[PDB]
Amino acid sequence: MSVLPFLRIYAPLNAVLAAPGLLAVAALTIPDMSGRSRLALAALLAVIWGAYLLQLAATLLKRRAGVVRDRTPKIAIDVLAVLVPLAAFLLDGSPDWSLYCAVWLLKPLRDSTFFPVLGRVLANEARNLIGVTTLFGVVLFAVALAAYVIERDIQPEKFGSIPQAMWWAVVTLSTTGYGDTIPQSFAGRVLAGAVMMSGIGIFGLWAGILATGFYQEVRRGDFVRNWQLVAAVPLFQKLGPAVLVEIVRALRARTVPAGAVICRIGEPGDRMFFVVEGSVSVATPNPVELGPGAFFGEMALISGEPRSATVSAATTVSLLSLHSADFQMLCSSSPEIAEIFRKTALERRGAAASA
Amino acid sequence: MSVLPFLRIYAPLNAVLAAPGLLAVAALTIPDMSGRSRLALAALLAVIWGAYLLQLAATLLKRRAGVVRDRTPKIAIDVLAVLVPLAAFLLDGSPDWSLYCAVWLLKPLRDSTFFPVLGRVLANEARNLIGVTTLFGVVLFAVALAAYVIERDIQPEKFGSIPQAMWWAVVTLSTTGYGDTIPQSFAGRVLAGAVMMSGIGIFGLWAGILATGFYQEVRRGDFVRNWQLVAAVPLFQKLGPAVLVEIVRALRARTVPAGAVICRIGEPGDRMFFVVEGSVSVATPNPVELGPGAFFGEMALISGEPRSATVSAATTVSLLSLHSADFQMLCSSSPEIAEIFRKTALERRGAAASA
Amino acid sequence: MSVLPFLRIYAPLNAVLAAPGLLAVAALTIPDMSGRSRLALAALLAVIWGAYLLQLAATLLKRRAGVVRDRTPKIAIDVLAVLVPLAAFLLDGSPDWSLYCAVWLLKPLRDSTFFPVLGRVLANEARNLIGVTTLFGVVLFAVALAAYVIERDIQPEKFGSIPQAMWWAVVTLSTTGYGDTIPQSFAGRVLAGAVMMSGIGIFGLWAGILATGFYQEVRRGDFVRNWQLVAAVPLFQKLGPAVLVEIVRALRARTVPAGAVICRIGEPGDRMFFVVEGSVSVATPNPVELGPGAFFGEMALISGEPRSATVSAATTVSLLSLHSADFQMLCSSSPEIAEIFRKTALERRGAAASA
Amino acid sequence: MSVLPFLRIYAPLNAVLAAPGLLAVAALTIPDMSGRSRLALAALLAVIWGAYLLQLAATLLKRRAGVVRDRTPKIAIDVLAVLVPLAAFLLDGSPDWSLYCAVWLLKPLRDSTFFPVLGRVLANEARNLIGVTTLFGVVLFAVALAAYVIERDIQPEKFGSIPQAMWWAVVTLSTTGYGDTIPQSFAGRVLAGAVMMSGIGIFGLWAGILATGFYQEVRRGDFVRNWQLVAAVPLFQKLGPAVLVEIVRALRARTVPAGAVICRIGEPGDRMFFVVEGSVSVATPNPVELGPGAFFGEMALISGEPRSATVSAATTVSLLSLHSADFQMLCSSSPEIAEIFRKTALERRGAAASA
Ligand SMILES: [K+]
Ligand SMILES: [K+]
């Protein structure tokens, strides 16, 4: 609610081409299809193949930034991105060689930030997951066995065994309800009463395990990335030690590309930003082009008024962002700083028009 | 638990008429129906059409409050509220013109506050949603492909292709369990074991993403709307800076219409209010009609007793509300203020009967 | 994890008899049944009827504690508890009069504390629920309509109308998957992709709305009930104002009946209690029978040792409970109090054996 | 995200053998199977039987650590681990004696820590669960009854009774959607509209009840286990009282086995550890083998640089772990301690190479 995401978050075309790349699978998979478009898209495989292969060697030029790097992840698939189709094309002379479009599916995951954010936490919290997973196996066979006791008599063809009953366990436990093989007797139908009660109690924790400290990591991701952009601000030699741990939990940083809009004049002013790198276009008779290490919005927050200036992203600006309360927290947190923001809320009234 | 919502929250009839408006669709949709009621409700379309159209021009008189406004949202549908049916009536000479009752469905959403509250946050947090959505696409085809490996042989008519297998993917992943095409072999039935385990882990985050900071926004909505009604209270020149950030998280404000009841005498006193605008009917021999900038309940909270007065909403009062603990927090937070509430818990004993 | 619930939480037999009471419904509902047990349980209705009716008049003696009370809830059903069966017995001469066993179902809810805890909060937070409920209606027909566009042609008997399509909406949205009427075409099967994605995003908030501040109320329920049992403790004239708001969030109170065990000797000591009313049996050569306003466990917590005494509930004791950390919080929160607990951890070593 | 789990968390083979043990059930359960492998695995039962029985007596030697112990849980199944199969083998002369493989399923749960963590909390919070469970029974029959009103006429074979309708209740309430018996009329199909709305509101709390304070216990589990490893650190005589309650919520402890890696040189330094027991291999010209009561990473955190030393687990080290922010919290929390970490960030530069 308090950030401006711009400049092509889903940027690199190395990721993009999997989506059209893998829909190219389908038409080969289908009888009664004409040969025209059949092979037209086989080229598209060769495009993407060639396209990453074009990209490939430029990556294999890993002399760029060659000091200390850990690029086993990034490179691992690029190699197989082109070999696996290639080795496939010959030995699998039959059309099923296209089935090695299971390969690019990592290419999104290759340059997928936020995916290592996932695997980072599992190796602290899987301690619970396994005791639950065991418990998930406890309750499976603890319950799955209860049915073979019963309907083996009058449902041999369905419940004439244990693992057939294990099938109806997770289906019945995992919220699903396929609807293939269901009891007829009473006591077995009694047993289902606890199952949904159970699995929804089970998953009530287990899926909760994920979001539990995942959110901590992401709420922590908003600090590790943001203890940066702190000392750059020339004012923050006076902030107390504990002051900062409060604030940075809310301060998310995102970038704006050049040319785009930041805050349009007259829109309801609801936030203020801290510029730390780049430059802006504060639309005034003298454009107050504040570069690295600046801010604006106190003209709008202290007064609670619309924007006093159409700020447009002159350049690639690494922005922070902040809603009022936590800035009211700040002006509450210290009178010493509202003084300059009091002055600045007067200086920028005269320094907007003037220089 | 600590607020009095009254005065027609679901007020404007511009919203109301969609509900009866769109049930008017149905009877036309149905064979073997008599023509009597068939066309009776076609009028009702013309009513609502005419009714908004009656409303319409009064809105197009946008000279009301014409200083600085952003009414592209509000007006966008009102225009189409009446044109789309109208242009429909002629070219679609066949009865299917009524199918342009897809149009009013925004009219609730037109004057739906709390809906922009939704879209506000997605443009900070969709960063995650897409990495998950990709991941949702990862796991779809990563898993959907695994089945065509198998049952293409003995289930051509069902699993004789990939996207047919993609169908059984999300159905099997998204908790649903339709029950149309299900395996027969073992290894494919093995694969389902992880699926529900997965999707319930997937959605265990992804739906959690929504409530995650949504609740922050709404818990923030209770501050942005409520840093108002602060300075109006004549007492709050002495409250510390950080005192307020604690409190306003709990203080929700709602309005009471005139005539209605606020706190009935003798009911178990469980809360106290801060009046800031309007007037009341404190039912006493001298009605202590406290107007803008007042409160009551300390007579009941300090003593923990029932109500000492039937307070009824004399007028349209913009109320705050507060349960004890956070008022006990207050009386704990400062002895200087309990003094006047000590006195007031004596003055209002004598000032209830007297003037 | 830190409380001792005892003394028949599910106590009153006025609640109990619904469960056997309503299973008495069934055998009448069933053909090919013998008349013997058919009417045997019709008596059991008359038992419970007579049993509450026996209870009834003793309740209608509402001279007990007759000062200020709000007993419209409690009495409302008791009246109908016996009239509704009675008026049923005659006019409904056919056996279906037993269908007025829909009546006792409130009798649990009659003396169901924790149920008003539910309805208390909905009248603060249903503001959201309705904007969501509208939104739930938005997305219903916004999506339900999309299908009649398509399969009316080749599925008249199933999708030959709108509300038939509304049926497949919520079924498909609400996680369920019945499996009666499913598409065959592509584009309609495309549409389901967003649905589960939606409804699981929808309910991802909406059910979250419930637990959101419900937990606040219950986490608040642990304070409102527990700002009691504070001043009774003779030591708590020195605790700071803000000290208490920290602590009582964790301190839950429950009662122990007489005779039962409290802490058995030698078990791993993990907590300490504050007695405020009743008496104990501290099993020592001189039983240190501490009555109202006492505590024990610091002998075990400071040393981190097993229990030094088999404490058994001599009487009906209203207990508090506390795990270490928040007592370590206390001994951390003030050195002035650890002094007496230092002394007490010596006095009770000598005062356990001695008097 | 901030811990190193190693040394065989899922260690004891007493747990392990259930998994292969119980898959041994299946092949006996199946007709048309050869007798060869039929009996081969019956031995495997005798293996595990004999294997625990081998383990058994060594456990019955409970003279180890015989001071004060509560081993009724641990021993209860071991006894039946071998008797139940044994008594089964004779009286159940038919092959169904193998059905007493319901017995080992506790053996995981025997030495399952984190399972008592489950049952600990239910006896504080089941107060709610039962009022909900009653409410779950309220809404069951409150709703289940509504259908027999209707479809008993034209669905006797399906809805010709109440409990048959109770079947379609929980199936329809508990998110499942089997798909066996579904209405045809309107008003009954109206009723389902609230059901999913209800049960997803129901379970929206009820499963939430579990994770609610479960997470508290586990977030409390990270303190009770970790008020240990506090005084051992020679520095922590100066930490304030309240300082610690902040920190230990994040500090999780895990063990590393001997030989394994701790922090490899050059990897991106993201955390620092507190050694309290064991020894390391700080790979330097003079290996700075810090034993009980040590730490490292401030060389990497203050500078925000990669690792300055390949630390490998020389021995079984009981490690703590800590990411920056909470160490930045520390260096923020007190200048007095950053002094020695300032010096140490210089001493270990010279004391890494030197001794
Ligand atoms: K389902
Ligand atoms: K189904």
Side-chain angles (χ1 to χ4, degrees), chain B residues 24 34 38 42 71 81 110 117 122 151-152 190 196 198 217 225 230-231 243 247 258 302 307 329:
Chain B
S34 67
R38 186 174 175 83
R71 301 284 74 75
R110 181 181 180 275
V117 174
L122 278 75
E151 297 294 328
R152 62 181 183 175
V190 178
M196 294 75 168
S198 66
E217 183 174 3
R225 295 179 70 192
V230 175
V243 176
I247 302 159
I302 299 163
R307 298 294 181 184
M329 187 181 289

Side-chain angles (χ1 to χ4, degrees), chain B residues 180-248:
Chain B
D180 55 358
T181 62
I182 293 167
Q184 293 185 0
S185 70
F186 183 75
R189 287 179 183 181
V190 178
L191 185 59
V195 177
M196 294 75 168
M197 188 180 286
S198 66
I200 300 170
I202 294 173
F203 297 154
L205 297 174
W206 181 71
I209 300 306
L210 299 173
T212 298
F214 175 80
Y215 172 70
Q216 192 284 132
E217 183 174 3
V218 181
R219 178 59 65 189
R220 184 61 179 270
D222 292 332
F223 183 80
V224 298
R225 295 179 70 192
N226 290 325
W227 183 65
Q228 292 84 17
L229 300 172
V230 175
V233 178
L235 183 61
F236 295 171
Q237 286 69 235
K238 300 293 186 182
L239 294 175
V243 176
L244 300 168
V245 176
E246 297 170 354
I247 302 159
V248 179

Side-chain angles (χ1 to χ4, degrees), chain C residues 155-207:
Chain C
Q155 293 175 350
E157 295 84 1
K158 285 86 167 66
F159 288 175
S161 68
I162 299 300
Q164 290 173 359
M166 295 174 73
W167 182 247
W168 184 67
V170 177
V171 171
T172 310
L173 184 65
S174 66
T175 318
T176 294
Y178 279 0
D180 55 358
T181 61
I182 293 167
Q184 293 184 1
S185 70
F186 183 75
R189 287 179 183 181
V190 178
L191 185 59
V195 177
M196 294 75 168
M197 188 180 286
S198 66
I200 300 170
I202 294 173
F203 297 154
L205 297 174
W206 181 71

